[PDB]
Structure formats: structure tokens, C-alpha cells
Enzyme design. Structure first.
Site, PDB file in Angstrom:
ATOM      1  N   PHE A  29      42.420  76.724  12.027  1.00  0.00           N
ATOM      2  CA  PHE A  29      42.196  75.404  11.410  1.00  0.00           C
ATOM      3  C   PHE A  29      41.655  75.457   9.986  1.00  0.00           C
ATOM      4  CE2 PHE A  29      39.108  71.873  10.743  1.00  0.00           C
ATOM      5  CZ  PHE A  29      39.956  70.774  10.808  1.00  0.00           C
ATOM      6  N   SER A  97      41.881  81.081  17.229  1.00  0.00           N
ATOM      7  CA  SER A  97      41.201  79.790  17.284  1.00  0.00           C
ATOM      8  C   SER A  97      42.306  78.730  17.326  1.00  0.00           C
ATOM      9  CB  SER A  97      40.252  79.635  16.106  1.00  0.00           C
ATOM     10  OG  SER A  97      39.403  78.508  16.313  1.00  0.00           O
ATOM     11  N   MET A  98      42.214  77.649  16.537  1.00  0.00           N
ATOM     12  CA  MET A  98      43.327  76.681  16.486  1.00  0.00           C
ATOM     13  C   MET A  98      44.741  77.280  16.576  1.00  0.00           C
ATOM     14  SD  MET A  98      44.443  73.361  14.090  1.00  0.00           S
ATOM     15  CE  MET A  98      45.389  74.349  12.952  1.00  0.00           C
ATOM     16  N   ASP A 196      31.118  84.671  19.726  1.00  0.00           N
ATOM     17  CA  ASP A 196      31.727  83.569  18.989  1.00  0.00           C
ATOM     18  C   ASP A 196      30.679  82.464  18.861  1.00  0.00           C
ATOM     19  OD1 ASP A 196      33.311  81.272  18.174  1.00  0.00           O
ATOM     20  OD2 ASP A 196      35.092  82.324  18.923  1.00  0.00           O
ATOM     21  N   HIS A 226      33.464  85.026  15.779  1.00  0.00           N
ATOM     22  CA  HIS A 226      34.653  84.178  15.870  1.00  0.00           C
ATOM     23  C   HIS A 226      35.951  84.690  15.252  1.00  0.00           C
ATOM     24  CE1 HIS A 226      36.999  80.662  16.565  1.00  0.00           C
ATOM     25  NE2 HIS A 226      37.081  80.329  15.289  1.00  0.00           N
TER      26      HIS A 226
END
Ligand SMILES: [Cl-]
Length: 250
Positions: A29, A97-98, A196, A226
Site C-alpha cells: 500500500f 502486505s496489501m 510485524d 513488517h
């Protein structure tokens, strides 16, 4: 593109055409193809056709980001899947992630996908904009906290401000994705960073329980925060994914 700004140096997409097995890599993201490039380059060297698109609104300027919807990001990934499908007869998807949310999303819409490798994928985030806005502050932008990355000799090229309009879009994407986990039946290899500080590690369990995949596993990353694809566990992610790809190539 209704993109008004040019692509940042280092944020260019990456395509490579090798063998009939393909890997689509989906960045996150805040980020750009930079976070996924070391994976993409390693998979290309191992013989895979590789597609690493730059999501619309990413890798330019946060104002560009602001006007995009999650439908635009899905479209970027769909076009990458389409590029691969023209060239390969086996397709795997991986993302951070995203990009992990978008990987899950794509698996829900195309079970011809032979397998997925989500990394710290986001499916249910309590703290959307963890304490920058309240429900009714509504700033246009939130200042970004910096990279949750342990290794200090690497960096993200993510924006310094996040449009709150984009956060809304992101929450909607996670909802439509989590709701439809049961649509996913391909083999799954699920990476999660113990430490994370952005996406709660419990998302791994929700993904693991929600998919109807019969072959599925969770792999814990012990030396990474993360942004694991750029962190100390990078070689482990690459080596375990390659093993995953080989064992399920069709
Ligand atoms: Cl990045």
C-alpha cells in the site's frame, strides 16, 4: 493513467520472460516495486517468467495515490496476471502486505492460479489509521510513521504522507477479500513476521482458517519486521518460495 506525476527512480516495474512457469509479485500500500525486486530478480534467475507491476498511484506522488481507488490497484494486478497468462501455463502469485491482500483477492477470482505466497498479508486491521485521526478528525493526509524494517542498510521508497481517502479504499479491499477467502483453493504458503508492528501476525491465522485450500502452511519469520522482503529474512523468503514453486509447478 490519470497519474499527474512521473515514476520515482527505483520504482519502475520489472518484467522478464523465461520459462513457462510465471510469478506475479505484488508490492504493498505505501510502497513500490522496490520492496519486491530482490524476489523478482532471484525468481527470474531461477528460470521463472516474472511480472512485477507498479500499482496505479504508487511510486509517483501521494496526490496521484489519493485519486485512485482499490479498483485501480486490482486493475494493475489483473493486467499483470493477464500479461503472465499470455506467456505462461502455470501462475503463482506472491505479495507483501496489501500486495498479499491483492494476492488473496486474485486467487479468489482465478482458481487457475497454481499457488499463492502472501507475506504479512493484511485482512483485518483494527488500527486503520492508528491514532492519527479519530473517527471525525478527517485530515486529508496522515504523516507516515517510517518503515517498519529491522535491517538499517536498506530502505523503502514509500511516500511520506498517506491520503486518508486511500485508507478508506484499503479497508474496503480488505473487507471484500476477507469475506471471500473460502473461494481460494490453491496451495498456500503463508509468511508472517513475528515482530510485524503494522499488520498483526494473527492475520496469518485468519487467512489460514478462511481459505478452503487443502495444502496450506504458515512460516514464521523470526528476524524481520513488517517489510520482510527487504529485511534480514529475505533469503529465507526467496529459498522457501522457490521450493514452494518447484513442488507445485503443475
Ligand atoms: Cl518500496
Amino acid at each position: 493513467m490519470s497519474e499527474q506525476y512521473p515514476v520515482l527512480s527505483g520504482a519502475e516495474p520489472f518484467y522478464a520472460e523465461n520459462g513457462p512457469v510465471g510469478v506475479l509479485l505484488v508490492h504493498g500500500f505505501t510502497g513500490t516495486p522496490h520492496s519486491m525486486r530482490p524476489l523478482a530478480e532471484a525468481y527470474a534467475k531461477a528460470g521463472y517468467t516474472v511480472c512485477l507491476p507498479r500499482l496505479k498511484g504508487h511510486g509517483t506522488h501521494y496526490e496521484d495515490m489519493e485519486r485512485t481507488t482499490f479498483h485501480d490497484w486490482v486493475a494493475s494486478v489483473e493486467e499483470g496476471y493477464g500479461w503472465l497468462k499470455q506467456r505462461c501455463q502455470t501462475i503463482f502469485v506472491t505479495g507483501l502486505s496489501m500486495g498479499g491482500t491483492l494476492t488473496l483477492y486474485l486467487a479468489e477470482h482465478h482458481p487457475d492460479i497454481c499457488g499463492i505466497v502472501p507475506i504479512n498479508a493484511a485482512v483485518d486491521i483494527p488500527a486503520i489509521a492508528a491514532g492519527m485521526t479519530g473517527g471525525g478528525e478527517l485530515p486529508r493526509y496522515l504523516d507516515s510513521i517510517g518503515s517498519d524494517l529491522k535491517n538499517p542498510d536498506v530502505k523503502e521508497l514509500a511516500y511520506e504522507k498517506t491520503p486518508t481517502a486511500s485508507l478508506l479504499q484499503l479497508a474496503r479491499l480488505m473487507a471484500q477479500t476477507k469475506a471471500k477467502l473460502d473461494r481460494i483453493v490453491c496451495p498456500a504458503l503463508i509468511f508472517v513476521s513475528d515482530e510485524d508492528h503494522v499488520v498483526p501476525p494473527g492475520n496469518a491465522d485468519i487467512i489460514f482458517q478462511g481459505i478452503s485450500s487443502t495444502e496450506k502452511e504458515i512460516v514464521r519469520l523470526r528476524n524481520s519486521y513488517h517489510v520482510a522482503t527487504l529485511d534480514y529474512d529475505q533469503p529465507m523468503i526467496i529459498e522457501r518460495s522457490l521450493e514452494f514453486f518447484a513442488k507445485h509447478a503443475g
